[PDB]
Amino acid sequence: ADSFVIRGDEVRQIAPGQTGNIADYNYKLPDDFTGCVIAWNSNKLDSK
């Protein structure tokens, strides 16, 4: 299991076989990947 926080409209860029700044330079996924991916909003608990 892995956990982190991203800026919000890069959530679709996490998926396998996709490119961009975040998924290119900080977290990459293998081509053949089986696990599940989860996300939710933390504005009220995180932005200040």
Partner: protein, 48 residues
């Protein structure tokens, strides 16, 4: 969508690219199979 493997790979994401690769590979295999079958049939009359 296209008849060039590297074009498929560059333009699409790995799953969909795999789908196209399988499509082309099955088509080419079946075509070669037809060639071999006709040739086998012809060889029999040549031998007669």
């Amino acid at each position: 969508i296209s008849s060039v493997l590297n074009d498929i790979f560059s333009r699409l994401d790995p799953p969909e690219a795999e789908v196209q690769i399988d499509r082309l590979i099955t088509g080419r295999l079946q075509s070669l199979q037809t060639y071999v079958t006709q040739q086998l049939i012809r060889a029999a009359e040549i031998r007669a």
